[PDB]
């Protein structure tokens with residue numbers, strides 16, 4: 215028989231997942247990208263910690279301790295908006311596709 | 320009717336395909352992959368497990384010299400020490416201290432624990448790829464299982480389903496893998512009979528039950544402490560124990576493309592790589608002639624709202640006048656917009672409601688019902704949330720062509736500059752013409 219770590223407190227930002235871990239004992243936290251290059255990373259946590267993960271377009275898979283894995287994907291959210299004024303439109307597309315935006319403009 | 324389509328290997332995502340058989344009503348099928356498994360062929364090279372060192376009681380001979388013979392045990396050594404004068408709890412071992420020698424020997428054997436606790440070193444070849452496919456056929460849910468090699472076709476409900484070959488030969492498993500339990504690792508294990516001390520493979524056998532054992536523990540017999548009969552030695556610690564502590568992450572956690580790894584048998588599950596061709600033999604009973612099918616006229620579309628939430632956040636309502644009661648098939652005429660419903664019912668004069676998912680900031684698309692296409696368009700809003708636990712239901716927006724509407728600013732600026740060039744070009748042309756004529 216093995217224990218299962220407490221469900222973490224989770225909040226979200228732009229292409230970002232923030233977790234608060236509350237272990238009783240040392241646990242292993244690890245994650246991988248679900249794309250071609252998994253960029254596998256792992257760490258041990260022996261205390262309450264704030265962990266910030268970056269979410270790729272392909273999606274991110276996160277596994278903590280003996281718990282079932284979580285999967286996350288980004289949405290096309292903006293602080294700018296489509297339509298409206300020309301500067302509102304550029305911000306909208308910049309936030310979603312910043313690389314291309316700088317090239318097209 | 321033979322219908323051939325190709326879908327992505329992404330698991331848990333439905334795809335819509337249109338069946339076009341002239342003279343009959345267009346039909347729409349829905350396909351989803353429920354599971355894709357890549358099961359490699361393995362050939363066992365050897366078993367690695369813990370070893371035990373066996374040391375028989377030492378032979379102590381005083382007033383004379385001890386001797387021994389070579390043995391053919393997996394790792395054997397024998398040595399004789401001189402000048403030994405051992406004591407027992409009740410006094411000196413023997414009467415004389417002259418010409419005293421001690422005969423020591425030791426050998427390595429496989430542990431009995433190797434029966435249950437061991438790692439297997441395998442060579443991997445190709446995989447017998449197969450998949451579980453869900454198909455929505457004539458409103459019915461049909462589930463089929465088959466090999467993704469373009470063979471071993473299976474017929475269900477008189478429909479013949481052929482899947483594969485796979486567009487990719489990708490596997491998370493390399494040529495050399497080691498299996499301990501539920502954890503598979505990619506490791507360049509050493510050749511059989513070439514193991515080294517303190518490292519994985521220090522002790523090897525071809526099978527768990529085999530009596531043919533290779534070992535390299537660098538076991539060296541040392542001189543005993545004076546007054547004692549103990550047999551000291553120098554030997555490397557088991558490489559198996561070191562490996563278990565230093566295994567690191569297994570493929571289940573490190574594999575690319577979101578592959579799931581399982582053992583007994585070793586297999587890769589639901590790898591998001593490439594695509595899978597599907598061919599379906601459809602019975603004529605599934606086709607309704609256009610003369611028998613219903614027909615729709617006076618069709619129009621409106622959009623109460625649209626949000627590109629990636630989860631069917633768009634809604635559209637289409638008004639129609641039906642010639643008669645019956646069913647029709649609904650299909651998008653663009654790859655930018657996905658319609659959730661495969662089919663709708665039509666009766667008299669009414670309206671139908673469907674949901675859709677798009678990456679477009681401005682939705683511009685045509686909806687095909689029973690051969691009566693309607694153009695529909697509306698502005699879409701962004702989602703409030705940033706992160707979801709599901710994959711998008713739609714496809715990508717990756718073309719410069721799909722920029723939003725109210726982009727007339729681009730056309731106005733481009734046209735304005737183009738006009739300046741066109742005018743300047745005309746001015747120069749006229750002057751050149753006049754200059755040419757003058758001599």
Ligand SMILES: *[C@H]1O[C@H](CO[C@H]2O[C@@H](C)[C@@H](O)[C@@H](O)[C@@H]2O)[C@@H](O[C@@H]2O[C@H](CO)[C@@H](O[C@H]3O[C@H](CO)[C@@H](O)[C@H](O)[C@@H]3O)[C@H](O)[C@H]2NC(C)=O)[C@H](O)[C@H]1NC(C)=O
Pocket residue numbers: 455458459460
């Ligand atoms: C078979 O055709 C469709 C699709 O087949 C689906 O069946 C369900 C039971 C699952 O096995 C699913 O994996 C499979 O794709 C059937 O329509 C499905 O009914 C689902 C009932 O559970 C329903 O799914 C979701 O919808 C409800 C209501 O919006 C929502 O609360 C839940 O998320 C729910 O799971 C959905 O209507 C549809 N499947 C999906 C996922 O879209 C249909 O019932 C069957 N027809 C027959 C009898 O041939």
Ligand SMILES: CC(C)CCC[C@@H](C)[C@H]1CC[C@H]2[C@@H]3CC=C4C[C@@H](O)CC[C@]4(C)[C@H]3CC[C@]12C
Pocket residue numbers: 300303304307308311314315318319716717718719720722723728729
């Ligand atoms: C006032 C004028 C300049 C507004 C122009 C807005 C233009 C420059 C912005 C708004 C939306 C943007 C596009 C959004 C989507 C894509 C798809 C991406 O895969 C490549 C970049 C591309 C094609 C962007 C190019 C730049 C873009 C078209």
